[PDB]
mmCIF file of all heavy atoms in Angstrom:
data_model
loop_
_atom_site.group_PDB
_atom_site.id
_atom_site.type_symbol
_atom_site.label_atom_id
_atom_site.label_comp_id
_atom_site.label_asym_id
_atom_site.label_seq_id
_atom_site.Cartn_x
_atom_site.Cartn_y
_atom_site.Cartn_z
ATOM 1 N N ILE C 24 5.647 0.651 -2.486
ATOM 2 C CA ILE C 24 5.901 1.503 -3.648
ATOM 3 C C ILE C 24 4.671 1.626 -4.530
ATOM 4 O O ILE C 24 4.281 2.729 -4.919
ATOM 5 C CB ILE C 24 7.112 0.979 -4.439
ATOM 6 C CG1 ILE C 24 8.384 1.084 -3.577
ATOM 7 C CG2 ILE C 24 7.265 1.755 -5.769
ATOM 8 C CD1 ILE C 24 9.613 0.386 -4.196
ATOM 9 N N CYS C 25 4.040 0.505 -4.874
ATOM 10 C CA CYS C 25 3.004 0.506 -5.889
ATOM 11 C C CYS C 25 1.641 0.098 -5.354
ATOM 12 O O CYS C 25 0.650 0.233 -6.080
ATOM 13 C CB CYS C 25 3.405 -0.424 -7.042
ATOM 14 S SG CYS C 25 3.334 -2.226 -6.631
ATOM 15 N N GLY C 26 1.552 -0.343 -4.099
ATOM 16 C CA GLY C 26 0.272 -0.685 -3.506
ATOM 17 C C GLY C 26 -0.251 -2.075 -3.809
ATOM 18 O O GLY C 26 -1.325 -2.446 -3.292
ATOM 19 N N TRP C 27 0.457 -2.857 -4.615
ATOM 20 C CA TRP C 27 -0.001 -4.202 -4.970
ATOM 21 C C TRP C 27 0.073 -5.124 -3.763
ATOM 22 O O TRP C 27 1.135 -5.232 -3.140
ATOM 23 C CB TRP C 27 0.872 -4.763 -6.103
ATOM 24 C CG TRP C 27 0.463 -6.166 -6.502
ATOM 25 C CD1 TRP C 27 1.104 -7.331 -6.203
ATOM 26 C CD2 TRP C 27 -0.669 -6.524 -7.309
ATOM 27 N NE1 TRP C 27 0.431 -8.407 -6.775
ATOM 28 C CE2 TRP C 27 -0.666 -7.928 -7.443
ATOM 29 C CE3 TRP C 27 -1.692 -5.790 -7.922
ATOM 30 C CZ2 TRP C 27 -1.660 -8.619 -8.167
ATOM 31 C CZ3 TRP C 27 -2.677 -6.482 -8.644
ATOM 32 C CH2 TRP C 27 -2.641 -7.867 -8.760
ATOM 33 N N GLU C 28 -1.059 -5.782 -3.420
ATOM 34 C CA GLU C 28 -1.052 -6.801 -2.375
ATOM 35 C C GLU C 28 -0.608 -8.127 -2.977
ATOM 36 O O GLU C 28 -1.128 -8.553 -4.018
ATOM 37 C CB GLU C 28 -2.434 -6.947 -1.728
ATOM 38 C CG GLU C 28 -2.411 -7.963 -0.618
ATOM 39 C CD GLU C 28 -3.655 -7.890 0.253
ATOM 40 O OE1 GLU C 28 -4.467 -6.979 0.013
ATOM 41 O OE2 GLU C 28 -3.783 -8.727 1.178
ATOM 42 N N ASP C 29 0.394 -8.751 -2.359
ATOM 43 C CA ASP C 29 1.099 -9.857 -3.005
ATOM 44 C C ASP C 29 0.286 -11.154 -2.838
ATOM 45 O O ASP C 29 0.611 -12.062 -2.075
ATOM 46 C CB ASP C 29 2.526 -9.946 -2.463
ATOM 47 C CG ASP C 29 3.314 -11.086 -3.072
ATOM 48 O OD1 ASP C 29 2.898 -11.587 -4.135
ATOM 49 O OD2 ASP C 29 4.342 -11.483 -2.482
ATOM 50 N N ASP C 30 -0.738 -11.257 -3.676
ATOM 51 C CA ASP C 30 -1.704 -12.357 -3.714
ATOM 52 C C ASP C 30 -1.204 -13.459 -4.641
ATOM 53 O O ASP C 30 -1.007 -13.200 -5.838
ATOM 54 C CB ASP C 30 -3.023 -11.795 -4.214
ATOM 55 C CG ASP C 30 -4.140 -12.845 -4.365
ATOM 56 O OD1 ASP C 30 -3.887 -13.977 -4.794
ATOM 57 O OD2 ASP C 30 -5.302 -12.494 -4.108
ATOM 58 N N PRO C 31 -1.028 -14.695 -4.164
ATOM 59 C CA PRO C 31 -0.390 -15.712 -5.010
ATOM 60 C C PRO C 31 -1.304 -16.224 -6.120
ATOM 61 O O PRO C 31 -0.807 -16.679 -7.159
ATOM 62 C CB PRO C 31 -0.025 -16.819 -4.007
ATOM 63 C CG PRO C 31 -1.094 -16.696 -2.943
ATOM 64 C CD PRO C 31 -1.397 -15.221 -2.834
ATOM 65 N N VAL C 32 -2.625 -16.157 -5.939
ATOM 66 C CA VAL C 32 -3.532 -16.505 -7.037
ATOM 67 C C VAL C 32 -3.342 -15.541 -8.204
ATOM 68 O O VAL C 32 -3.334 -15.948 -9.374
ATOM 69 C CB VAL C 32 -4.983 -16.501 -6.530
ATOM 70 C CG1 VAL C 32 -5.980 -16.682 -7.676
ATOM 71 C CG2 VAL C 32 -5.143 -17.613 -5.525
ATOM 72 N N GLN C 33 -3.178 -14.251 -7.899
ATOM 73 C CA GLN C 33 -3.078 -13.233 -8.940
ATOM 74 C C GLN C 33 -1.690 -13.169 -9.574
ATOM 75 O O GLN C 33 -1.582 -12.740 -10.728
ATOM 76 C CB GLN C 33 -3.482 -11.868 -8.378
ATOM 77 C CG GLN C 33 -4.990 -11.818 -8.092
ATOM 78 C CD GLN C 33 -5.480 -10.441 -7.675
ATOM 79 O OE1 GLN C 33 -5.194 -9.999 -6.571
ATOM 80 N NE2 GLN C 33 -6.250 -9.774 -8.542
ATOM 81 N N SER C 34 -0.618 -13.556 -8.856
ATOM 82 C CA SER C 34 0.657 -13.713 -9.559
ATOM 83 C C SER C 34 0.702 -15.007 -10.371
ATOM 84 O O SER C 34 1.323 -15.043 -11.442
ATOM 85 C CB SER C 34 1.848 -13.616 -8.583
ATOM 86 O OG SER C 34 1.874 -14.658 -7.620
ATOM 87 N N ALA C 35 0.039 -16.072 -9.924
ATOM 88 C CA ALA C 35 0.019 -17.290 -10.738
ATOM 89 C C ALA C 35 -0.845 -17.121 -11.988
ATOM 90 O O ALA C 35 -0.602 -17.781 -13.002
ATOM 91 C CB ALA C 35 -0.468 -18.480 -9.909
ATOM 92 N N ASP C 36 -1.844 -16.244 -11.938
ATOM 93 C CA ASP C 36 -2.700 -15.933 -13.081
ATOM 94 C C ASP C 36 -2.765 -14.420 -13.225
ATOM 95 O O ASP C 36 -3.630 -13.755 -12.629
ATOM 96 C CB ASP C 36 -4.091 -16.514 -12.885
ATOM 97 C CG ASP C 36 -4.989 -16.281 -14.084
ATOM 98 O OD1 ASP C 36 -4.588 -15.540 -15.021
ATOM 99 O OD2 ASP C 36 -6.099 -16.837 -14.067
#
Side-chain angles (χ1 to χ4, degrees):
Chain C
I24 295 171
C25 72
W27 179 255
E28 182 166 355
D29 179 18
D30 178 321
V32 173
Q33 290 186 288
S34 64
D36 183 352

